[PDB]
């Protein structure tokens, strides 16, 4: 996945707060990670894939290879079973945890990188610009 | 220092080997770090700036703030003192160790970043371009 390498900052992003309160991310939890515009950083060496999120006070990093199963520990601390694909040239990532599964895509649009997240008919969408 | 951060990949390298010899690395050392191209992930949150140098093999980080020392373990283990401050637009770094010390320029060149490392007249300059 050459194309989603580079450093990416936040410009823009609708319904998160009621995504991660969809997913069943406490107020308070979901406040401070509501409370700040993050950095994403997306590297690959080899065949691992690394994908970083930092912030001024929570930070995340997860790496995997495309299509092989990881255990991933999110920013709201849930403990998630993910797979990574690359399908129609967008990272797909599924999480899976209590009969529960939510959908994360991220995809090149243009100079620009959109992340959409959906779970139960409530769709998130955050712009990212090269930094 | 907004202008350096990014990920940056190595498009060009002369006297590295001879720069590392002048420092001390050990062959063997001298050998790993040489035969691979280095990924440069330059990052500011807030007055930290982190710098990370990430390979198939040899992964670095280091985090500081302008202007206050901090104690670092280099690539090839060396346990040296360094202060980065940002002079004349670019980021100059100076490692001191065993009354030994060398410069480690950073500088912006267009679309480039370009790093200029001096030790006892020997130089090396690295040229990486944005990923």
Same mark, same amino acid.
């Given at each position: 996945?050459?194309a ?11 319904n ?70 690359? $399908? #129609?040239?967008? &990272? @797909? ?5 209590? =009969?529960?599964?939510? +959908?994360?895509?991220?995809? /090149? $649009? #243009?100079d620009? &990188? @959109? ?5 139960? =008919?409530?769709?998130? +969408?955050?712009?990212?610009? /090269?930094?």
């Open positions: 996945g050459d989603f390498v580079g450093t990416w900052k936040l410009v823009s992003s609708e998160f707060d009621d995504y991660m309160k969809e997913v069943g991310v406490g107020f308070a939890t979901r406040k401070d990670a509501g409370m700040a515009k993050p950095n994403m950083i997306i590297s690959v060496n080899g065949d691992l894939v690394t994908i970083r999120s930092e912030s001024t006070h929570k930070n995340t990093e997860i790496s995997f290879k495309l299509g092989v199963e990881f255990d991933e520990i999110t920013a709201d601390d849930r403990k998630v079973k993910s797979i990574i694909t690359l $399908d #129609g040239g967008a &990272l @797909v990532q599924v999480q899976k945890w209590d =009969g529960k599964s939510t +959908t994360i895509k991220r995809k /090149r $649009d #243009g620009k &990188l @959109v992340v959409e997240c959906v779970m139960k =008919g409530v769709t998130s +969408t955050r712009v990212y610009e /090269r930094a």
